Amino acid sequence: HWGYGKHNGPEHWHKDFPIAKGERQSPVDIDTHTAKYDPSLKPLSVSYDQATSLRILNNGHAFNVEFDDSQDKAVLKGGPLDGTYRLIQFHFHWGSLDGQGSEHTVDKKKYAAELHLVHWNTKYGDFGKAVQQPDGLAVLGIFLKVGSAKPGLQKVVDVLDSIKTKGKSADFTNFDPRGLLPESLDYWTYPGSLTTPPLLECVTWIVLKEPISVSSEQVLKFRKLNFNGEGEPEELMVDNWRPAQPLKNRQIKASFK
Ligand SMILES: [Zn+2]
């Protein structure tokens, strides 16, 4: 039932998913002046050299690029994390206009889009078990701004024509996610949730300070995707973002001063 329209969007989610009103929901606004530098944070380690991508899917809500998580090939360690977290998929949230689209906000500023690299804790054995745990996932969030083109994103935009409508998938091998990262690994971190149903409170969020830049032509191709299935009235896949949720009893920590 759920989606991003007037009759099924974020303000309706709580009827099927009561945790939508919970104590550690995501996204949030990051107030930069209230966030605390934490000297206890250890350095962040992104090890993506052996990543194995498999394919790309339009699921009616976004598109997902899916990875082989049957071994430690692409992992996230360090920072706030205890242990090893395996890369399972990435996806994006974006807007109808360049001034909206991100899920997290920085001093109330919305970016054009947000990339989520989703990782699960190998102590739990599989992704479905990990989402039932408070420390089961680590999501690396990266903001996108419209300016220069991102060469490492072009291969993704090149394949979107083949997955226009809900339920379509395609082969997507040999894509290197290192090409989606900014120069700096400086970050904010806090405990939160999945940003789509089932909204489970299982995520350690790691949100990079430095946005990546993409071109207008790249973001326009995201906005050509469809929420509907093939043969149905067209509904463009835009504004598939959940707004900021109450911070409640949480503190956001910074890795940098
Ligand atoms: Zn997401």
CATH number of residue 246's parent domain: 3.10.200.10
Within 10 angstroms of residue 188's Cβ, the number of other Cβ atoms is 22
Query: What's the sign of the alpha-carbon dihedral 36, 41, 47, 53?
Result: negative
Total domain count for the chain?
Answer: 1
Please give the distance, rounded to the nearest whole angstrom, from the Cα atom of residue 26 to the centre of ligand 1.
10
Domain of 152 in residue numbering reads as: 1-257
Within 10 angstroms of residue 67's Cβ, the number of other Cβ atoms is 25
Is residue 104 annotated as part of the catalytic site, yes or no? no
Please give the distance, rounded to the nearest whole angstrom, from the Cα atom of residue 116 to the centre of ligand 1.
5
Please give the distance, rounded to the nearest whole angstrom, from the Cα atom of residue 66 to the centre of ligand 1.
13
Resolution (A): 1.3
Contact indicator for 193, 25 with CB cutoff of 8 Å: yes
Query: What's the sign of the alpha-carbon dihedral 5, 200, 86, 41?
Result: positive
Hey, which bits of 48-95 come out as E strands? 53-58, 63-67, 75-78, 85-94
Binding site as annotated, residues for Zn(2+):
91, 93, 116
Binding site as annotated, residues:
91, 93, 116, 195-196
Give the span between the Cα atoms of 210 and 219, in whole angstroms.
18
Catalytic, out of 12, 61, 104, 119: 61
CA-CA distances (angstroms) from residue 255 to 78, 92, 121?
Answer: 12, 24, 21
Closest C-alpha among 11, 30, 31 to residue 21:
11
Start-to-end CA distance of the chain, whole Å, equals 44
Give the span between the Cα atoms of 92 and 107, in whole angstroms.
21
Give the span between the Cα atoms of 197 and 16, in whole angstroms.
9
Q: In 3-state terms, what secondary structure has residue 220?
A: helix
Which residues have CB under 8 Å from 193's CB, separation 6+? Answer: 19, 22, 24, 25, 26, 199, 200, 201, 202, 203
Type of residue found at 182: P
| Structural biology method used | X-ray
Phi-psi region of 247 (alpha: psi -120 to 50; beta: other; left: phi over 0): alpha
